[PDB]
Write a protein that binds this ligand. Sequence first.
Ligand code: 3NY
Length: 247
Amino acid sequence: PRYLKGWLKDVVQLSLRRPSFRASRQRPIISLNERILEFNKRNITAIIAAYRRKSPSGLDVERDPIEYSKFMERYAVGLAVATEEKYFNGSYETLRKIASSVSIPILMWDFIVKESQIDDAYNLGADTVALIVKILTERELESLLEYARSYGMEPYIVINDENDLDIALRIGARFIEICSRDLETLEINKENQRKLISMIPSNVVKVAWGGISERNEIEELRKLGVNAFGIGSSLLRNPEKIKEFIL
Ligand SMILES: O=[N+]([O-])c1ccc2[nH]nnc2c1
């Protein structure tokens, strides 16, 4: 990984030691980036809802993951499931159960630093996995991106600044999350997010993530070319708010 500090250094050491999941996949790969493009063609707002318990950017929320996921199946373009253990109180078992209960695309949100975590994502039923430029070298990114593609997944490349966007372009990312939240400091900068969005070619599927809370900001971002919108805490507090974000 990269040289890191603070909680990101801790979570990378944890991920390096995380045991593998050793069962077989029991569902097809359902492409999230293609379903986003289909929603775009249907002029349906494409919302990626997240399930987590703890978060460095929120108070804990304890709710039933299956009631939540089955509700979101009716409205969301896909579901992100936070599986990191210490800072998100996530679990592979939770991802496994959600993936078995719904038929929309599932993104595994974790801090992927070794190929076995991609094996894990595949075997658990996730359709794609996040790769975070801030924690990986260019060599590691390209290797993990190629490894995920060899399973038929199109990884979800997470960027937060200009250096990250440069690396995402270098490595041939086709599916990019422009995250407004710096993971080291937890600060949000939407001006920087919009600058990055303006520098991404049209053929890349773009997801805006980070402090999205209002229908009007979705519409503004869609006008700038963003294809889909990620929303965590707001929907974890009140799932039914997604109906307003779409309608
Ligand atoms: O909790 N999440 O599933 C989740 C998904 C994507 C994100 N991007 N930035 N933070 C994120 C959190």
